[PDB]
Amino acid sequence: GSDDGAFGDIWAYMSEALTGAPGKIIACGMLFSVAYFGVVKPNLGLALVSALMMLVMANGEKIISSFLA
Amino acid sequence: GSDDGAFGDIWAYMSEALTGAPGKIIACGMLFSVAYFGVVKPNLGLALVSALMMLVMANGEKIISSFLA
Amino acid sequence: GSDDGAFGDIWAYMSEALTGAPGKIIACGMLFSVAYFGVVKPNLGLALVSALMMLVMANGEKIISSFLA
Amino acid sequence: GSDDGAFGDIWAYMSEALTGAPGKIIACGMLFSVAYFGVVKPNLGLALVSALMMLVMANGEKIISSFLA
Amino acid sequence: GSDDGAFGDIWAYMSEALTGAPGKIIACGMLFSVAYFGVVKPNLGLALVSALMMLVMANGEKIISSFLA
Amino acid sequence: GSDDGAFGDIWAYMSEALTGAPGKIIACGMLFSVAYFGVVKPNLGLALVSALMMLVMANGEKIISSFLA
Amino acid sequence: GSDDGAFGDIWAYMSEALTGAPGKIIACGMLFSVAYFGVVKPNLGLALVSALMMLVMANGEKIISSFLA
Amino acid sequence: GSDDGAFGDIWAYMSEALTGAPGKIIACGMLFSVAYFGVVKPNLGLALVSALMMLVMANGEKIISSFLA
Amino acid sequence: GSDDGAFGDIWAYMSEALTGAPGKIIACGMLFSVAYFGVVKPNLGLALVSALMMLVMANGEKIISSFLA
Amino acid sequence: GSDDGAFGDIWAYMSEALTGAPGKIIACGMLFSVAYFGVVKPNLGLALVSALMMLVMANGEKIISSFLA
Amino acid sequence: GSDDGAFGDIWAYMSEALTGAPGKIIACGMLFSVAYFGVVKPNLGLALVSALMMLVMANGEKIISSFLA
Amino acid sequence: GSDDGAFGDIWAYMSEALTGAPGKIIACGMLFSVAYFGVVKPNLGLALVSALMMLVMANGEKIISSFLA
Amino acid sequence: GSDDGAFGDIWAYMSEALTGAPGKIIACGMLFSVAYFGVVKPNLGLALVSALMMLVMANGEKIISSFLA
Amino acid sequence: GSDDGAFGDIWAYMSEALTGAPGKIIACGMLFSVAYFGVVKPNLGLALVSALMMLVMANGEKIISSFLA
Amino acid sequence: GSDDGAFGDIWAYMSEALTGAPGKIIACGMLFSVAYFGVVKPNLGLALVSALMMLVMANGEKIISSFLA
Amino acid sequence: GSDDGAFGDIWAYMSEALTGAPGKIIACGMLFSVAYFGVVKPNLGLALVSALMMLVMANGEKIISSFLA
Amino acid sequence: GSDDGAFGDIWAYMSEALTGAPGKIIACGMLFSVAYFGVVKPNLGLALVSALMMLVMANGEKIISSFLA
Amino acid sequence: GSDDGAFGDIWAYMSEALTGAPGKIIACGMLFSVAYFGVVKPNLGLALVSALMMLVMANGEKIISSFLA
Amino acid sequence: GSDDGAFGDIWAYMSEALTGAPGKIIACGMLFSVAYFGVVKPNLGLALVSALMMLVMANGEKIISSFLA
Amino acid sequence: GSDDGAFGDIWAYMSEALTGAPGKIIACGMLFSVAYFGVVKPNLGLALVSALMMLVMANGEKIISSFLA
Numbered sequence A, B, C, D, E, F, G, H, I, J, K, L, M, N, O, P, Q, R, S, T: 001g002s003d004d005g006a007f008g009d010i011w012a013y014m015s016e017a018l019t020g021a022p023g024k025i026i027a028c029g030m031l032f033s034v035a036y037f038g039v040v041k042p043n044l045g046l047a048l049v050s051a052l053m054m055l056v057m058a059n060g061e062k063i064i065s066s067f068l069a
Ligand SMILES: CCCCCCCCCCCCCCCC(=O)OC[C@H](COP(=O)(O)OC[C@@H](O)CO)OC(=O)CCCCCCCCCCCCCCC
Pocket: C007, C010, C013, C014, C017, C022, D022, D025, D026, D029, D030, D032, D033, D036, E036, E037, E039, E040, E041
């Protein structure tokens, strides 16, 4: 596909925000949820799953660009 | 079918935008939704389904052209 | 029925446009809707239903000609 | 009733046009409407109802002739 | 009443035309309207009502003769 | 009530058509709807309700004659 | 009130037709509507309401005579 | 009831299409839905219910003919 | 039933696609789901159920043809 | 069945991804889960079951192709 | 209240039909629903509730007469 | 207020009919609706609400007379 | 304002009829409507609103006299 | 109550069908469900409950007749 | 009860399929489940319970016929 | 509060029916539910809770009168 | 409380049925459940609890009458 | 605010009826609902919530007067 | 703005009635609605929202005067 | 209690089946379980407990009749 056009700026902002401030805010919310739900039932596997989801988010732009040429 | 005509330009723009900037914006929205809904209930299967839907989108033009000759 | 007459050209244009540029535009809109509504609730069954509807559209001329002789 | 008279030609043209070019144009419009309204809410039952209405149209001449002798 | 007189021929022509060519033309117009209005909102009940009205038309002469002796 | 009169033929045709060709067409439409809506949500209770409604239709003439003497 | 007079015959015909051929035709139309609208949404309560309305029609003459002495 | 009349052809086409091409298309859609919904939650009971509904469809003509004489 | 008609091509495409590319895609999705849900709770019985459902899909055309003659 | 068609590319990508990068990611997640759940309750049988599931995944394409011709 | 009047016959028919043929039909429908919904989830408590509702129906006339003098 | 006047007879008839034949007919319709809607979803609370509404109807004359002196 | 004059008698009759026979007839109609609409959807809140409206009607003369001196 | 009337035939058919072909079909569906749900979790108590429900169905006519005189 | 009627063929097919191919498929699924769940926890009592359930299935037709005359 | 007024009779009937026939019917339904749900899972604590709820019902009038003066 | 009224017959039937045929049926179901669940895990304490629950049922009328005066 | 005026009587009646006969009727309905919904699922917490709501109702006049001076 | 003028008296009356008798009547209606809708679904949050709305009403004059100088 | 009524036949069948064929089947299942569980851990006390439970079953009718008069 083409990264430019009328919607090039919107796509660019979304791609940078995936690993930018909004993505970091979502990751921090994930860490907060993992810590909070571990008060009654301590489960560190959710931390591993959250780290995997951050890894997926960091590669979201590459995945989208590879699927949508 | 015929790709040209009075509506040839509209169809061409839609076909390029399917894998272009609007399609990439929709894919980024999918990734954002997957990350956000994983804050409380981490589910990486939704990431696989989203990747499958991006794969479907990348082949949307071929599917439409094959069905509608 | 008879394919010719005073309205033969209008019917011919409609039949070609069913699988032509307007039909392809409608199919692309279907794919866009499937991708967009899958952002919050990923549902790939709607993709199958859309493909079935494109298959119905590709056979619309034959169906109309068979019903209306 | 009698198929001939001063209005025999008008009735003949209407009867042939029911399954002719105008009837086929209306059927194609039905298919276009079914495809278009299925973009947001895919509903293939409307396709079945449209096919039933084409079947009714194909038998319109027989029905009218049977009711009006 | 009496079927003959100065207006016997006019009444005779009207009675035959009720189920004749003009009545059949009106019935065909009813079928065309049912098909056309079903493009956007498919409603096969209007077909049943139209068939009932053709049935009423086929019995119009008997009804008029029974009411007006 | 009286089954004859100016409207005796219309009532007779309606009574025979209740269990005749139009009634059978409506019953077949009921079966088609039951089969179609069972694609996504299989529900065989609707088949029982449809059979009950066909049973009601088969007794419609008797019910109308008993209520309207 | 008085059942006779200049309009005695019209009132008599209306009273007999309430439970006669026209009333039976209206009841058959009610049954047809109940069957038809039950194709997509099977609802047998409408059958009960229709039977109640036929019961009201069968007692229409008595009600009118009691209210209008 | 009577299988013939003005609507004899429509009823005949509906009866053959119940077990014909449209009925087979609906059955194939049922199988596709059963396979698709079994991706996340494998449930082979829905296959049995679908087979029962195909069995009901195969006997739809007999049921309608028995109920509506 | 009859495999041909106005909807013969749609039924043919559906029957081939049941064991064709779309059916294989659904089967691959089943395998992916079995593998993914086995990360936390390894259950190889779901693999057996998925294989049984693929076996059912491979025989879907025969089942539909036997039920709907 | 046929490996080609409008959905040939999607099926091809799914088949390669079953033993490709996504399949390897799922297998690595299986190994991570086996290691993590063995911290408190060391169970090496889950490792054997995970290896069996990887063996099933490696043969998923052959199984799907054999079941769906 | 008074059981007679212009609406005495309608009320009488309704009161007898509460425990008559229509009431028995509704009770049989209740039993059919209890049996059908017990295929997947056998629940005999619904049978007890249905029997209680039949008991309420059998006393409906007395309740209505006591409340409405 | 005053119970007499030009509209004294109409008000008297309405007051007696509230607990008379029309009120009893409405109560019987309430019982029929409660029984019918309990076929699929047995709910005896609606019976209690209906009994409360009959109790309200039995006291309607007193309430109206107290509010409107 | 002044209660007397050329229109003093009309205003007096209207004021007495607000809580007199016509007002009571309207209140009875309100109760009948509440009972009737509660057959299918039992809603006793409408009874409370109707009682409030009767309370408003009982104070209509005082309100009108206070606003219009 | 009375077994005859306008709805006598419908009630008769329902009563015979309770223990007739439809009742036997529902019982066979119960047995099929008991066998199917016993594949993973063998529970023969559901067979006893199903037999009890068939016993209830066999006595449904007597129960309805006793409750509704 | 009566084995014939409009639903005689459906009941006949269900009765033969109880001990026919679908019943044998369910029994084979039972044996597969018994073998599979015995990999980790060998329990041959489940085999006895499965054999008892096959014995119940073989007598399902007799039980249903005895309960529902 | 005041026990009298336009709604004094309705409140009186409700207060007596709380410990009267309807309250006793609800208590008997509670006992029936306790007995029925104890067939599979015998739990006599529900009997104690039901007795406590009957005790609450017996004191409902006093509680309502104390709260609402 | 009062044992009579509009709901006196319903309460009477419920009270007799508590220790009558339905109560005995529930007790027999309790004994059947005790015997069945004792096949794998023989527990005669459940028999004692069931006997206690039958004793509670036999005194249900007295308990309800004492609590609800 | 001011308690008097054109609407002083309506407000006075509403304030007394909040803790008067209508308020007591609503409280009795609350108790009836608590008792009825406790037949299947005994929950005495709803009784506490209902008592709290009666306490709120008893203080409704004071709350309204304090908020609206 | 200016509080005086031709419409000064109307505005003054509206401002006093906001917290006067009509405002108190509306607040009492709010409390009645909260109590009534809590019969089936007890929800004390609606009481808090109603109290907040009374607080808003008490400050309506100040808000309007501040916005409209 | 009373052994007769609407549920007299169901209770009679249950009472005879307690010591009839179903009771004997349950007893045989008890003996089979005792024999099977004695393969690894021979325990003849379970045989004594099973015999005691058969003795309880043989007296179930007398116990139920004595408790429920
Ligand atoms: C150029 C490409 C080929 C055409 C593709 C599209 C064809 C249009 C059908 C899809 C639109 C569906 C959604 C519409 C959205 C919509 O709301 O439409 C509104 C518009 C008005 O229809 P009705 O009068 O049914 O509507 C009443 C209200 O709904 C008004 O909104 O519908 C139509 O005009 C479409 C039906 C025309 C179909 C009949 C055409 C054949 C008749 C003429 C034959 C020639 C006469 C020659 C005389 C010389």
